[PDB]
């Protein structure tokens, strides 16, 4: 229609439907005024977001020690990059969409208008496709940004897409064409679900306290942004060698007998038999007898002797293998040298020697979790319990500089390393040198075979374990803390002085402590934080500063003179330092409310002057103009961070709060107002129905492509290879152009 309803503030330009030239004259005024307001809103919403940054940031005082007597004192602010902090920043930039929907309903006598709901659905398309496409491209070439936290991304992105699906449900599925009171409130009450999940995710899903911390300079004067990062000649027969060597776990030892000399075209018979030395048959090795036949043309024959494995520590032991009874079928063959081989068995059943890698270690306070390796040296036999604890030194830590930890490390069989995780508290100190200690106690062998328990003379209680090791049942020692059935437990419990010697060697293989049993941990300041503060001090009455900054290279002159009216006007906003950011917060949200009252009028009168629908002018123009604050917030996090969580999450967080507060509050107020009059609140579903389904179909394509860029050929959601970088960006811009073109046609009934 060509008839314009009177706005909240702006009067109707009269007379209506004047001519064709006057429509061009009037619409040019409305378009330029609306674009100038969009320029103003981006300036004030930037300052509104910076005030939110100060409210949610802790203020720290930095002492800067110097070799001279004078030491300068500086105060900074650390803004933690959490999901709970980012969902408030996504809330701050969505104030133009949220306020416009509420103002339009309440301003126009609680009647559903096309401009507000469409600029929220149309903002989702601009946010999901255009902003994400730009974040893919701004990452420098050769660098990727990957979503580290994919469980959180799935839950949040589903909730944002469901927000627009749920909007379809209340308009078309449940009581179509009418919004009920419970429908309006339930839309609003999904917003606290976003808030609680953000708090839950920081506590348990992310463990933000214990991630590696990185610091970057914020956009404000003294703000420092802290985020997550990645934590840094007749024939004769004789043995080949004459002395063979083997481990105990070899299974069999290989001996090579050689017939050499004489004539090969003959048959040679030789007998072999093992004889006990230091190692005894049936206990350390398998007794073996046999006869070796040398065929014509055959020179060497391998024989194999079984080596019996066990669990008990022993010294190096040896046994003898002899050759005898050389014979020839049908002198010619004799017994050569060496005629006897000595096989020496190396034991490997030492339970271990436990030590630290180095005696002194240096960690930064931003490490989060530090992992200290405890090494097991010269043997890894049996299960060994190694107690450990933390000792306070200069770092008095009970949550102050670190978290006290103690316990027992259980080294399994054939396991040679385990780690100790100590939680180091980050305090944002410019200069720090604190010391605490980590010590390991006497190791105890808690799991062994039955015969080893005889040799170690263990007098405790054992429960038989289902595990088997070297063909014997494995027994585990009962601790006092454990309460067993007491029928399950077994007490395994004049020696010949050879068995006494067997016990003495067996105790030589019990677990002991190594060179470094105490670790000194020196907590130091972060190099990244120290360098960040050093960046600040190089380049860093406040009422007066804003007005001097308001008025100040040809391209810069164009932008300066365009926005000089806005910068001077918004220099009357209180400085963010007053009332801990709240003085700036109250005044900024009032001005945002004022300029989106004008935008609602300027967009309304622009459409009806040229016949453009409020659905079309909200999707194309108002949706793009109010997402300028969201675009710069995502772009900075895409480049300056290390991951893509904050950049993509700002898009997802914006999309959710647009529906839940922008439409939830506006339709709650309208439905309640009509219910007090005993009347229904009627919203025409047809315009919004096709828009929200077109978004969700296009959103799954966007989410699908983002998940497809996780392959190692691409490497991450953002950045990546340059040829794939353009294709992802051009596809997502194509999805937005397809959305706004199809939505415009459906508005005009062109299907």
């Amino acid at each position, epitope marked *: 229609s060509y008839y314009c309803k009177k706005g909240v503030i702006l009067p109707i330009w009269e007379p209506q439907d004047p001519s064709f030239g006057d429509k061009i004259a009037r619409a040019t005024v409305y378009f330029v005024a609306m674009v100038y307001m969009f320029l103003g809103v981006s300036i004030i919403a930037d300052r509104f977001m910076s005030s939110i940054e100060v409210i949610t940031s802790q203020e720290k005082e930095i002492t800067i020690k110097k070799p001279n007597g004078e030491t300068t004192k500086t105060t900074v602010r650390i803004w933690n990059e959490t999901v709970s902090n980012l969902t408030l920043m996504a809330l701050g930039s969505s104030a133009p969409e949220i306020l416009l929907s509420v103002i339009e309903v309440c301003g126009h006598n609680f009647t559903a208008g096309d401009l507000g709901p469409s600029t929220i659905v149309g903002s989702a398309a601009f946010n999901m496709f255009i902003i994400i496409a730009l974040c893919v491209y701004v990452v420098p070439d050769g660098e990727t940004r990957k979503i580290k936290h994919l469980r959180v991304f799935f839950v949040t992105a589903a909730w944002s897409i469901f927000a627009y699906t749920w909007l379809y449900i209340i308009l078309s599925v449940i009581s179509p064409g009418v919004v009920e009171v419970w429908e309006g409130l339930l839309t609003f009450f999904f917003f606290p679900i976003c808030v609680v999940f953000a708090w839950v995710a920081d506590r348990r899903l992310l463990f933000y306290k214990y991630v590696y911390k990185r610091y970057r300079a914020g956009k404000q004067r003294g703000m420092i942004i802290e985020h997550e990062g990645d934590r840094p000649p007749v024939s004769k027969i004789f043995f080949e060698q004459g002395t063979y060597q083997c481990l105990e776990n070899c299974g069999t030892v290989a001996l090579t007998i050689i017939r050499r000399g004489g004539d090969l075209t003959n048959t040679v018979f030789v007998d072999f038999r093992t004889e006990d030395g230091t190692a005894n048959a049936g206990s350390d090795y398998e007794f073996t007898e046999g006869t070796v036949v040398f065929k014509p043309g055959d020179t060497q024959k391998e024989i194999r002797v079984g080596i019996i494995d066990d669990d008990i520590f022993e010294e190096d032991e040896n046994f003898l293998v002899h050759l005898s009874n050389v014979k020839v079928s049908s002198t010619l063959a004799c017994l050569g040298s060496p005629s006897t081989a000595t096989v020496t068995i190396f034991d490997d059943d030492h339970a271990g020697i436990f030590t630290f890698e180095e005696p002194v270690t240096h960690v930064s306070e931003s490490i989060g979790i530090m992992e200290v390796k405890v090494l097991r040296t010269s043997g890894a036999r049996g299960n060994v*319990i190694v*107690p450990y*604890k933390t*000792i306070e030194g200069t770092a008095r830590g009970g949550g102050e500089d670190f978290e006290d930890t103690c316990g027992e490390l259980e080294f399994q069989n054939d396991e040679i390393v385990k780690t100790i995780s100590v939680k180091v508290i980050d305090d944002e100190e410019y200069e720090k040198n604190k010391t605490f*200690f980590l*010590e*390991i*106690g*006497e190791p*105890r*062998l*808690v799991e062994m075979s039955e015969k080893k328990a005889l040799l170690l*003379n*263990e*007098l*405790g*209680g054992f429960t038989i374990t289902g595990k088997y090791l070297f063909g014997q049942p494995v027994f585990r*020692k*009962v*601790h*006092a*803390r454990e309460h067993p059935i007491l029928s399950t437990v077994i007490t395994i419990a004049p020696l010949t002085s050879k068995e006494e010697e067997e016990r*003495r060697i067996a105790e030589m293989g019990r677990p*002991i*402590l190594g*060179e470094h*049993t*105490k670790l000194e941990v020196i907590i130091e300041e972060s190099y990244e934080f120290k360098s960040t503060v050093d960046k600040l001090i190089k380049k860093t009455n406040s009422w007066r500063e804003q007005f001097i900054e308001a008025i100040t290279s040809c391209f810069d002159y164009v932008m300066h003179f365009l926005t000089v009216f806005w910068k001077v006007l918004f220099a009357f906003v209180p400085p963010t330092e007053y009332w801990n950011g709240w003085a700036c917060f109250i005044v900024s949200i009032l001005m945002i409310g004022l300029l989106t009252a004008f935008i609602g009028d300027l967009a309304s009168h622009f459409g009806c002057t040229i016949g453009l629908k409020d659905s079309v002018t909200a999707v194309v123009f108002v949706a793009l103009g109010t997402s300028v604050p969201d675009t710069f917030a995502s772009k900075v996090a895409a480049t300056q961070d290390q991951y893509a969580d904050a950049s993509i999450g700002n898009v997802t967080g914006s999309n959710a709060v647009n529906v839940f507060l922008g439409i939830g509050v506006a339709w709650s107020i309208a439905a309640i107002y009509h219910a007090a009059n005993g009347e229904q609140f009627k919203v025409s579903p047809g315009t919004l129905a096709f828009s929200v389904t077109l978004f969700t179909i296009f959103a799954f394509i966007n989410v699908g492509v983002l998940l497809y860029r996780r392959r190692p050929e691409i490497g991450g959601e953002l950045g990546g290879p340059r040829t794939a970088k353009l294709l992802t960006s051009c596809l997502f811009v194509l999805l937005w152009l397809l959305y706004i073109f199809f939505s415009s046609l459906e508005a005009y009934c062109h299907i």
Partner: antibody
Framework: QVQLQQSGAELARPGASVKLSCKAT????????MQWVKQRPGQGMEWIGAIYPGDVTSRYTQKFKGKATLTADKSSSTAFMQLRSLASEDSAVYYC??????????????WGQGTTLTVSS | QAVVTQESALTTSPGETVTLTCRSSTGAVTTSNYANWVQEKPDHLFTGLIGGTNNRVPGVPARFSGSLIGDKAALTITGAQTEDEAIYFC?????????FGGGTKLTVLG
């Protein structure tokens, strides 16, 4: 308030066996090691061994390996040391000492009052 | 098999500083010997003073310190009191056993 209280003075004949007790109170008995130490006049002191009552793990010196047997009764929070085949050298004073299990800390924190054993006929 | 050797006795006056020596037969006392210093009062009262060559037991007076001097462990008493008259033993940790010293009969005049 850690206290280790031992049994009284004991006289035993040569070639016999004897059991000595040390009741520990004021701390968690099963989570700490117990040191057993021997004192003779003019021969300094000799470390007999140690026992961990939680697992009943033991440490001994080669000389006292067969001579002394270290046991625990965690229900009554008592540690026992049994000497077998007594001789004239065994007349001494025996002590129990608390150890936390870590070598950086003191290995002989709290001592018992000492039990004197006399082996004579 | 090692033998730990100490001086037979030490004699000091109240308020002075005394140093007690723990020597190892096999060589130089290291931090892997974990030198312990314990105290025997009259009538068989034993107290553990220092363990781990440096660490001092809670409740021990602050005048007792342990250190490594040269090739031997040392107990330093700064401002010795009249109540410090006792017999001091040093225990050194070898691979699998503790060896105790002879015991210094430290006496303080009164």
């Amino acid at each position: 308030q850690v206290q280790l209280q031992q049994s009284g003075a004991e006289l035993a004949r040569p070639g016999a066996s004897v059991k000595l007790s040390c009741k520990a109170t004021g701390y968690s008995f099963t989570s700490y090691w117990m040191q057993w130490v021997k004192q003779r006049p003019g021969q300094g002191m000799e470390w007999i061994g140690a026992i961990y009552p939680g697992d009943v793990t033991s440490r001994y010196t080669q000389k006292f390996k067969g001579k002394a047997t270290l046991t625990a009764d965690k229900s009554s929070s008592t540690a026992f040391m049994q000497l077998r085949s007594l001789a004239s050298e065994d007349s001494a004073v025996y002590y129990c000492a608390r150890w936390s299990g870590y070598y950086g800390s003191s290995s002989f924190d709290y001592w018992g009052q000492g039990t004197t054993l006399t082996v004579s006929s | 098999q090692a033998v730990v050797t100490q001086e037979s006795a030490l004699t000091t006056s109240p308020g002075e500083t005394v140093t007690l020596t723990c020597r190892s037969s096999t060589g130089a006392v290291t931090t892997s010997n974990y030198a312990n210093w314990v105290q025997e009062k009259p009538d068989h009262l034993f107290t553990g003073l220092i363990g781990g060559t440096n660490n001092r037991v809670p409740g021990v007076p602050a005048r007792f310190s342990g250190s490594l001097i040269g090739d031997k462990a040392a107990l330093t008493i700064t401002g010795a009191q009249t109540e410090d008259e006792a017999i001091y033993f040093c225990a050194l940790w070898y691979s699998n056993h503790w060896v105790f010293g002879g015991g210094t009969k430290l006496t303080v005049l009164g």
